[PDB]
Design a protein around this nucleic acid. Structure first.
Lengths: 27, 132, 88
RNA sequence: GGCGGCCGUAACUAUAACGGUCCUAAGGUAGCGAAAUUCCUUGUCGGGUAAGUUCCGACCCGCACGAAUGGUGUAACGAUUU
RNA sequence: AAGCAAUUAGGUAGCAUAAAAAUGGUCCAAACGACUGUUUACCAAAAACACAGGUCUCUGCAAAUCUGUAAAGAGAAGUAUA
RNA sequence: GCGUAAAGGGUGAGUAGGCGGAUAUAUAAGUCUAUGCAUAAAAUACCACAGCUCAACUGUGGACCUAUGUUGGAAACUAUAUGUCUAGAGUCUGAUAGAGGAAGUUAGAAUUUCUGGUGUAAGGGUGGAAUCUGUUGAUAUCAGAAAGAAUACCGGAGGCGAAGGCGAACUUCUGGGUCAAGACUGACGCUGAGUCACGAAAGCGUAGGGAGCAAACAGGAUUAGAUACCCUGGUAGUCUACGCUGUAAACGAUGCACACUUGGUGUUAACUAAAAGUUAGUACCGAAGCUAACGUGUUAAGUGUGCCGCCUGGGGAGUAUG
RNA sequence: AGCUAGUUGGUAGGGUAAAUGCCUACCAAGGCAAUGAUAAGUAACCGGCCUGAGAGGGUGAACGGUCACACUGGAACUGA
């Protein structure tokens, strides 16, 4: 496969994890 | 074991042997298998079939028929009814397989009969298979 | 382990004769003996998981045999469960 | 026990993600923030009131919050305070 | 009158039928402390102290520690899960 | 339709459900038939024939389906009830391979630290350096002691297990597979929504342990900058016991089961004294066939079916909310 | 994703042209539900209409049959 689609998924996952890390410890 | 076809097992074995071009094929034995092979024999699709023995279990050895150019007599042989999809038909709605060039085989009140015989005796039933 | 002696002993008890290993009652009794000593073994070795899988496969086999027997021969089935202690 | 300054920088305006520089043992992270801490101050906006220097929800320009002198929350509890 | 009782039905009387006395006001939100307790006898009962829980560190037994110039005693008739 | 385009669940055991060997009899739910007999109002819809100057429109007859009820038959198949058989699947007997699992013991090499000798100015490290270590005796070398973790060689076109996974040695406990005339049961089976069990590594709770390695972090370099690649250190973690989390490119990107369909070259186990062959696996190449192509090709992605899971343009989005 | 407490069933009685928790008084706790109860949203239904080779899909104008309503919400009288 070209791998561009896998890269797209990767950056999406990173942004989502970063969102969750940011909003952890918040309450 | 889930054989699921005493019918489709023989149909598949016969189909495979026929296309690779064997001389005979060796099937399990049952009343319906005998009836179907009998119908084949009248219709001129197979040469003959014999009853046999191996380890105390009865077999049916069928003699495949080909033309002189090793083109099989059977072209396509395929099931219609099926345990997950049972197909019944009235004697009027019976399909004529390939404009009659092939034959339809059904199981009816009066036994396993070809489609033409079913039409001529005005009886219908389960559509076993189509051969052309 | 179930040693050859108790194996044959249970065969003799539960079958119609000395050669009747394959009858359903003998089958269920042997599997019950296996289940009992396996639950004993697995009570001790709690982190043993292959053995637990084997035990569960045996239990499934026993349930299958029990349904077949109860459907076919019912009164023999009730006699058998009462004798073996298998609750219903 | 301690946990910094100054200056410049974007398709208006604004700010400065960024860059340079001096100094120190290191220059405050998470979270919280006109707070039992905010002088200027009755800061600004929203809610409540016909009208609210108090109160609640935010903004962050934190004079002078800050992580076991614990930080931020929390069901239940309080002859406590509002 | 029914019903074992609690209550149910009908009738009667009053403005009022737990008729006197005794016998919780409730709800929403915020701050602090978890909580039951303790404290300035005689102006401060609290947000202070204590608390279960947590971490660091000391102590091999004529133990560390404490009181005394000492002996000696506590620790302890215990033994690092102390 | 689901190897690579969107689509096979991480894996298994099983409930309901679906489906299922051979054969005998009975029932007639399914199916079929007499397109019996009725009921499916009328109109509309179909075919002819008529009346409005024709048509639309309107009217009179004739039917085609298929829907229910009922009458009398047929019985192969599905279904229902009672039997029979053994070729499927199991039990028993014998043989046999294996890092299968759990618990309890033991071993050596190597490394680090500590102690005691010999001995002197470097060691260490890189593309090149420096940080760091060392005149408080380093590195190197000899002897002794202690602790932790991991098991070179065997060791691979292996083996076992459902998968994850499992390799120093021994015992105990224990799971599975394979072969056969070698007897027994007589379809006892396949798949399986919920559910349950297991599930690399990372992570979490409690209590230990901590040699080496090593997120975060510190210092030294490269660079305009280096919150990195490189170097010197270094806390969690890596390890053990118990209790949670249940995620992977958990892959063969290929669910499971059965009946079939030319061969070549190796290899594992068994039967055979061994060759030689068979059976059950495990790899490479490859005919036909299949495939959009790559490729696949008896371990199908070939010819058939049973059941389950899953897909319906991309982004938003595996997000928001519950 | 749980719902129903006249709710489920029983014994009597009230009432109706007439059966029934239709209603009432007592006696039990039962009844329904991942083979979808309950709840929310939407909608009159059918003969039919449109489309299509067919199977199906969409749809319920006119006409004909049934049902419900006549300002919103109740109630009884007359009467076959």
């Amino acid at each position: 496969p070209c791998g561009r689609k896998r890269k797209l998924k990767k950056i999406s996952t990173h942004k989502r994890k970063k969102k969750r890390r940011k909003n952890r410890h918040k309450k | 074991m889930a054989i699921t076809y005493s019918i489709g097992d023989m149909l598949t074995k016969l189909r495979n042997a026929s296309r690779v071009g064997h001389g005979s094929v060796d099937l399990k034995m049952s009343n319906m298998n005998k009836s179907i092979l009998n119908i084949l024999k009248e219709e001129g699709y197979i040469k003959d079939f014999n009853f046999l023995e191996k380890k105390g279990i009865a077999f049916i050895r069928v003699l495949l028929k080909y033309d002189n150019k090793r083109n099989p007599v059977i072209n396509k042989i395929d099931a219609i009814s099926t345990p997950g999809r049972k197909i019944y038909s009235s004697y009027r709605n019976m399909p004529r397989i390939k404009n009659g060039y092939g034959i339809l085989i059904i199981s009816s009140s009066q036994g396993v009969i070809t489609g033409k015989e079913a039409k001529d005796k005005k009886i219908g039933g389960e559509l076993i298979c189509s051969v052309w | 382990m179930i040693d050859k002696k108790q194996k044959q002993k249970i065969v003799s008890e539960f079958g119609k004769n000395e050669s009747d290993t394959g009858s359903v009652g003998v089958q269920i009794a042997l599997i019950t003996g296996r289940i009992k000593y396996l639950t004993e073994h697995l009570k001790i070795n709690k982190k043993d998981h292959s053995s637990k899988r084997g035990l569960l496969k045996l239990v499934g086999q026993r349930r299958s045999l029990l349904r077949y027997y109860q459907k076919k021969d019912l009164e023999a089935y009730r006699m058998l469960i009462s004798k073996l202690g298998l609750r219903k």
